[PDB]
Design a protein around this ligand. Structure first.
Ligand SMILES: *[B]([O])([O])[C]SC1=NC2=[C][C]=[C][C]=C2N1[C]C1=C(C(F)(F)F)[C]=C(C(F)(F)F)[C]=[C]1
Length: 252
């Protein structure tokens, strides 16, 4: 409870300090990146990077993986019919597959997955993944400004480990998840990721962008968290992309 707001485990790694305060501007937060070739971490605002926040829609990454693992969806059929409930976003008011659900951050699709996953399986997975505080609370949308929290630094460690280590998750599930996360591809790179946005009292409280980049030469996992200013998922994405471009990760 007391420091389940904080990730205190140190890195058995090389960790390079960054200054991206100019790109963040009047936004508060942190940026973490890991290079697979260097096996090294680059961090802006290491202090903020270890403070745990609700993952919001970034957790859909994991609900997707859990849904694939448990065969709730698969590569032949990940489609789910709209139940004819009018949401205030037209992209939600229709049938979805994993790709559209992930792209448009359709809560009801991922809530429908969560509803079919037994709590004991989720507790086991968060323990094995080392996902943040692993706090499931009431087990009702626990990832949306609720009990479950994770740090920006952990967003990178946990995602990298889940994808890159040989674990109980199949390659095909990781591949289908990856496809759902692809944002941009040109001759130089592929950019994958997921936004998250928390809203408290009609105001932005918490912005995320978690993802990875494949180039010709390397693979980088990264995440941006915004705690203040204009802390939206969209804004976290723009900041991520400016930082990655500057660092030579994104060309073209
Ligand atoms: B996840 O991205 O963190 C979920 S975002 C989310 N969930 C809800 C529930 C109720 C009301 C709003 C809401 N949002 C925000 C949202 C956004 C945006 F604010 F983040 F921009 C955008 C969209 C969409 F238009 F579809 F792209 C839907 C919801």
């Amino acid at each position: 409870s007391i420091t389940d707001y904080n990730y205190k485990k140190p890195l058995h790694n090389d960790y390079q300090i960054l200054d991206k305060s100019k790109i963040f501007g009047s936004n508060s937060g942190s940026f973490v990146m890991y290079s697979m070739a260097a096996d090294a971490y680059y961090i802006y605002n290491e202090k903020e990077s270890r403070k745990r926040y609700s993952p919001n829609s970034t957790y859909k990454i994991y609900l997707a993986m859990f849904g694939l693992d448990r065969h709730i969806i698969n590569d032949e059929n990940s489609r789910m019919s709209w139940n004819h409930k009018h949401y205030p976003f037209d992209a939600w008011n229709k049938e979805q597959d994993l790709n559209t659900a992930m792209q448009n951050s359709v809560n009801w699709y991922f809530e429908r997955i969560s509803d079919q996953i037994p709590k004991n399986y989720t507790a086991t997975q968060l323990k094995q993944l080392n996902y943040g505080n692993k706090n499931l609370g009431s087990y009702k949308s626990y990832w949306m400004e609720d009990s479950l929290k994770i740090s920006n630094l952990e967003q990178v460690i946990v995602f990298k480990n889940m994808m890159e280590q040989n674990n109980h998750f199949s390659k095909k599930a990781k591949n289908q998840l990856s496809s759902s996360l692809l944002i941009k591809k040109n001759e130089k790179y592929e950019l994958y990721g997921k936004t998250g946005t928390g809203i408290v009292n009609g105001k932005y409280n918490n912005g995320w962008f978690v993802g990875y980049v494949i180039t010709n030469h390397d693979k980088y996992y990264f995440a941006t968290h915004l705690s203040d200013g204009k802390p939206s998922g969209k804004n976290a994405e723009l900041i991520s992309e400016k930082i990655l471009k500057e660092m030579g990760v994104l060309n073209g």
